[PDB]
Design a protein around this ligand. Structure first.
Ligand SMILES: O=C(O)CCC(=O)C(=O)O
Ligand SMILES: [Mn+2]
Length: 350
């Protein structure tokens, strides 16, 4: 029939219309229903914190190693990005999502109202009619390489959105480079081993918007997933919690102070470092009272080399833990398995 299921609703509009319950395509399926944690732990463990300005020192590099091996992510302080620039990119995000739907839909990622592409305002690809939908919208923009930006999908109001996002992305790219240099040293690989695969590499800004949900126990704001990136640099809502990370089968809340950044490895890095460091599975749970926003800067490698464990980590006593795949096949796997709520990297394990 008419594949209207391929063009899902804007979730912010569902919430504004006043749905009393999540429509059926957003409902989790038992397995995920039993694992939705809405209550905080009351005695959470301290989270790993890394001070970028101290990262040349052995003691700080050790804190990074502990974070990368045991958590897959860390809070980052003293990272050099002006606090007011962080405020501006988030507030201009709020200003965009607060615009009338008529205006926002000019940036829809459903071309002609039906044809899906990644870039734009909407949600991720709907592959099957029985696919579960997340309780969020997102504005997904290619920021890098700068010459490949399509400004027809960048909001023109607020007027400064483009300038502020580009300035913000310049800072997070510098952070990306500093972190990957420290990771190369931890792995005893050439300090520029990852820089070669980042030449003219794609990078994206994912502005997530999680509307309030009348039944936060029945949906996910964004489904459990690991990022497919090399590195993700995440700026979370400073007022509204919801991010959670999986560690040893348990979910725990991730709470960050304003202007602290969250850095996590993606599946590309887990493969390239042969699983010495882990790409963490995370999710966002909704709440019934307030919307939540986040901005994920998603840093991928270029398509010049196949994705595989670094040769310097492999020898006669140290086998590869993941098989080699082209970037095109890796991309299709990350995107396709996300739609099914499955973990693509598991299919690569040897
Ligand atoms: O909203 C968040 O805190 C997480 C976003 C996220 O996981 C992603 O955009 O990949
Ligand atoms: Mn993510």
């Amino acid at each position: 029939a008419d594949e209207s299921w391929r063009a899902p609703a804007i979730v912010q509009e569902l919430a504004a219309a006043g749905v009393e319950e999540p429509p059926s395509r957003y409902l989790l399926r038992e397995k995920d229903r039993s694992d939705v944690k809405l209550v905080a732990a009351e005695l959470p463990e301290p989270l790993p914190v890394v001070d970028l300005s101290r990262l040349d020192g052995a003691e700080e590099a050790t804190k990074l190693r502990v974070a990368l091996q045991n958590w897959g992510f860390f809070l980052l302080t003293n990272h050099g990005v002006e606090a007011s620039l962080m405020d501006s990119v988030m507030n201009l995000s709020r200003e965009f999502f607060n615009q009338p739907i008529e205006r926002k839909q000019k940036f829809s990622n459903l071309i002609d109202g039906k044809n899906f592409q990644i870039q734009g305002y909407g949600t991720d690809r709907v592959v099957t009619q029985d696919q579960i939908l997340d309780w969020s919208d997102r504005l997904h923009l290619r920021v890098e390489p700068k010459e490949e930006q399509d400004l027809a999908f960048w909001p023109d109001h607020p007027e400064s959105f483009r300038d502020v996002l580009n300035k913000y992305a310049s800072g997070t790219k510098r952070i990306r480079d500093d972190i990957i240099q420290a990771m190369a040293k931890l792995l005893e690989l050439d300090e520029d081993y990852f820089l070669d695969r980042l030449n003219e590499a794609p990078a994206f800004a994912r502005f997530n918007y999680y509307p309030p949900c009348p039944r936060p126990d029945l949906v996910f704001g964004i489904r459990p997933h690991s990022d497919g990136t090399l590195l993700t640099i995440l700026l979370v809502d400073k007022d509204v919690s919801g991010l959670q990370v999986q560690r040893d089968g348990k979910w725990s809340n991730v709470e960050a102070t304003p202007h602290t950044l969250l850095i996590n490895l993606g599946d590309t890095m887990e493969v390239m470092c042969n699983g010495i460091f882990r790409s963490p599975v995370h999710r966002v749970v909704t709440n019934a009272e307030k919307e939540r926003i986040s901005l994920a800067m998603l840093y991928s490698v270029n398509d010049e080399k196949d994705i595989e464990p670094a040769a310097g980590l492999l020898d006669e006593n140290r086998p590869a833990r993941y098989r080699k795949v082209s970037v095109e096949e890796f991309r299709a796997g990350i995107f396709g398995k996300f739609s099914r709520g499955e973990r693509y990297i598991d299919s690569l394990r040897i």
